[PDB]
Amino acid sequence: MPFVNKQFNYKDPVNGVDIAYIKIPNAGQMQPVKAFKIHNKIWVIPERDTFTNPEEGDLNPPPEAKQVPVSYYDSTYLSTDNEKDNYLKGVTKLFERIYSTDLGRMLLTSIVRGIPFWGGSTIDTELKVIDTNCINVIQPDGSYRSEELNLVIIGPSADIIQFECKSFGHEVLNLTRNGYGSTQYIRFSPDFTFGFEESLEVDTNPLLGAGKFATDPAVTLAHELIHAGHRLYGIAINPNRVFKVNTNAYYEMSGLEVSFEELRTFGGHDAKFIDSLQENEFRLYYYNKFKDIASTLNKAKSIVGTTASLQYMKNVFKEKYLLSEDTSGKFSVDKLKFDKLYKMLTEIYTEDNFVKFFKVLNRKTYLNFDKAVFKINIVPKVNYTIYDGFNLRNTNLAANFNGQNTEINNMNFTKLKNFTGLFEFYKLLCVRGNDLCIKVNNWDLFFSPSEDNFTNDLNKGEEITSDTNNISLDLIQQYYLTFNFDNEPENISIENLSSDIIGQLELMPNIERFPNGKKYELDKYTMFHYLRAQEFEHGKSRIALTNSVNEALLNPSRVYTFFSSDYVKKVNKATEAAMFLGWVEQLVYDFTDETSEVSTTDKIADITIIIPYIGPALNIGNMLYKDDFVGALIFSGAVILLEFIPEIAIPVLGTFALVSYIANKVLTVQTIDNALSKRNEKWDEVYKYIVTNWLAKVNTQIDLIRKKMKEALENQAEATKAIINYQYNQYTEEEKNNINFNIDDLSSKLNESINKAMININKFLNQCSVSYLMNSMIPYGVKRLEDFDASLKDALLKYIYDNRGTLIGQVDRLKDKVNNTLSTDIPFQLSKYVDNQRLLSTFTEYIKNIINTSILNLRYESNHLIDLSRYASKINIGSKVNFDPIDKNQIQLFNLESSKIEVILKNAIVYNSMYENFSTSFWIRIPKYFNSISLNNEYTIINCMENNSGWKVSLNYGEIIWTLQDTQEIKQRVVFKYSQMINISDYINRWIFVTITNNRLNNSKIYINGRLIDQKPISNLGNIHASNNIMFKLDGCRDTHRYIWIKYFNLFDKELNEKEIKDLYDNQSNSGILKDFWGDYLQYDKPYYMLNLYDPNKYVDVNNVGIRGYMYLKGPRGSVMTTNIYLNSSLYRGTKFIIKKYANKDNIVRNNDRVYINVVVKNKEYRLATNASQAGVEKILSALEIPDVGNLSQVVVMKSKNDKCKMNLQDNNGNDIGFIGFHQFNNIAKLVASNWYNRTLGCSWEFIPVDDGWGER
Description:
InterPro entries: Bot/tetX_LC, Clostridium_toxin_transloc, ConA-like_dom_sf, Kunitz_inhibitor_STI-like_sf, Toxin_rcpt-bd_C, Toxin_rcpt-bd_N, Toxin_trans. Zn(2+) binds at residues 223, 227, 262. The structure is a monomer. The chain has 21 helices and 51 strands. The protein folds into 4 domains: 19-421, Metalloproteases ("zincins"), catalytic domain like (Zincin-like, Alpha-Beta Complex); 538-844, Clostridium botulinum neurotoxin B, "coiled-coil" domain (Up-down Bundle); 850-1068, Jelly Rolls (Sandwich); 1091-1246, Trefoil (Acidic Fibroblast Growth Factor, subunit A) (Trefoil). The chain is of the alpha+beta class.
């Protein structure tokens, strides 16, 4: 679109309308300079910054450098006609490019409409234009004319890449802050650009380049134009309002002059650093300023120095500030229109939205600091395009943003020297030992916000009355459709000003330069030391990779490597000339496998993938080991990754005060409705504050971790490439002619391997960030929210009880609403707080699982019993508690005073009404009741009540109980029925899945093996204390040989429906592993008896040893019975089965695991197979002798699908022989292998091991 009408040449003659010599305001002197008018209210001066500041007319480097990240100074720049024409053409092309996009179109239209206020008159009834907001052009016939404008594009200052915005103010009035606005001057250069590293856009565009990525100049120009949009409208935040950051720590930065204006113009995650209190304060402040502008407009009635009328300027300022006019003509600022305008200018007119519309690559956060400046020539169409930019279409450079890479598009970018050396503004770090000091660049350090920037109004008592109360691309499109474009201000003639307009630049607050070179003494090799050990210089000596950070930092040639020692040894070895190439693909493949290595244990649901090499790369957790890193991560979580621990201090939420009302049912129910609604907004506000703190601290630390991982991978790749090049260049010339070796292909394959590893790292770090957010921040806020909800519930119950006179009939319905709504929490939805798609996907993956969304998960990890849900810190296990060596998750409790675990949920997490909506579940094994003492001996195994209020899990003879108790001593129970007087042990000494759901409002339920069985109402119960401790002890058990086998203890917060209980039952049932009769894991090389389902009373025996005798079933099995104690059927005695491995998962069998079946007869082990007949529909199996089985095939597959342990038997040729059916025959005593059952049936068997819980000899 034609943003610039005429194409301008610097050699063109002056006209006095579009091209002329102009005199901008200044103090000392003003020699006229040529200017270029490209559109309304915008002017271009292709001259270096020397005349807008009389004190800063110098272009040489200053004696003292600046606190900016990158700067390069040139004296004879923009001094020649051709170079100035280059500058002008670049600016014109950049304006056209920005105007092409819709957001750019909106921004530029707003810039044109934003005429600064005419409030420089002492007289209140006179709109006098401020002289410093207008310039003096010069006609070709000597006369000079004063003209109004908004923005001027000036060249850069002594520092070329200090792109800044400057303005001329008034003596006492703050033009850019009181909403008046002022003329802005932009110091810019479309031929210089920065370079930023990338570590996040690897999932969408895997096949991207390496090295540095060049910033699109249109992005920086849009940044400056957004600054102009802020300042012309006067909503510019005070420069002294700096986002204060701590400095005293070594890992922090010595200082950043970061302002809320930078955050406002950046957008995205940086804009979320401003807490709701401060942004609401700014909105109210600038709303009052807009009201003041409206009041000034109302009482003006006059303008001096314009041939036009008053209403023209009135309308211009109205269209600017979006004021509302009434019939009388008075102006008022509507809150909705002003909120729309402020939203558009604050969180919509952001650089990130432009980048999303430019479809280019930028720096994700403001904390991403540049390192190099690049010379670019934007004039020719082949180097830059209006529609597409550096990424030229229909060629190589379009895909994967190659047009902005500094190694593939080197014909468009030229590197320039950096005056700001990387070790000039540094924050020195020393590790005491031979002190090891590295001058870490100040712009390569952690971002630590201060606590003062985060202020909350939560600790306040709102008075509840009867009349109280995201921006994706879609909302940007919505405002684009509603935006107004065809209305732009004209250029009216103001009366001639002075010949030289006196003016002075607005005095920015004197920035106290932070003290350079601040030494720190440490005792730990931080991340910076490791990354410094991982780099080198392009010399010519032996670049030998070493696994020691200490030795790497003491030698420039040696480079630290965190990869496996085998790869290090391979890359270091001397290579024969012929074997050069083979070693090249060997190292390429080994490097790719090392980088893409996602491995280690998966005994955690919070984080799906754990990447171990981050351990010895960035020294996360102050350890450099794979196993140590994974173990400490499981033990702690994302806490170890963060270096400084965020400290969120939620205040005690002010109790709502209920206004009393009389003789008004409608008002008194609207009061309760408004209390519930404002409770909803309070939940929203606390969640938002938590999210803001998280994004400020944890996310920034994690992002620095991502960038450092990218740098570590790059350094390893470059070290490998350099040693490969050294080996190539070390050979003889003839051999070099033989070997057509290339370095571009090696670089490309290594870079793609790095990209894949980066995808892995990004997923891992997103998982860790969401882990910390949901584990260590949300519960803290939810505690205060729920305590406030309980206090509010009590107060509302008092209110409704008091006002029952006018609410007869509707008491219970309001009681129902108050009870139901308050006992049910409000779920956490990240889509309402963070719009990052990657973090959102990680959050969705986190919340789709139930194990991680709990409050207590007793799991055994790395020789320690921990809670995967970080809701407790002190789990005090007793000395007389045992874990199964095969499965350490198994935990067994005895009848000892020290067979206990003290689960202490810290008082900073637990709220009072935690056990109102309470759900618990645990797998349990209750052994057979042996002695008569168990009769009427109700023993409690799980205790939560300390004295009188809580829960208490008790068990009776064949009866599982769930006992509750309130303060007033009322007790309600729920019962499961299973009879010990049954022949088969369906539940005795078996594995029982017991789930209890407690809805205090309606009912309490108990679920056994995922089935509803019984429920007794508990709505009559009183208050329940949320005790600090959970007691795991069989207190009240008189039997001295009674124990339980508990595992998988989970506490939830909601009422878990049938579907979720079934899903958790299936998940913890471990369907991928065979189970014995008791439900434990099935093993190898161990005795195991045999049981049958379709014929449960068959006693398996043998008739003869060898092929001459087949397996037998010797009638009844016998029964076990003790009077008035128990009645079952004896399970032991008979033949014995042993599982022998054929084709690791040691001592554990999984689905489709081929094994050898071993049958023990008379202290001798025999094989179970038969390949002698191959007739009928079955094979009469026999106890085969000696490993000379030979042609007979005993391979057995356990098809442990959804369930009954199937026993599929195949041949040595791979074809299936059949299942073990019963007999298909007359005399019922055999064991066969029949294919009929392959196509409840008889193909069902169980294995009984010697269990001490049975007690049968």
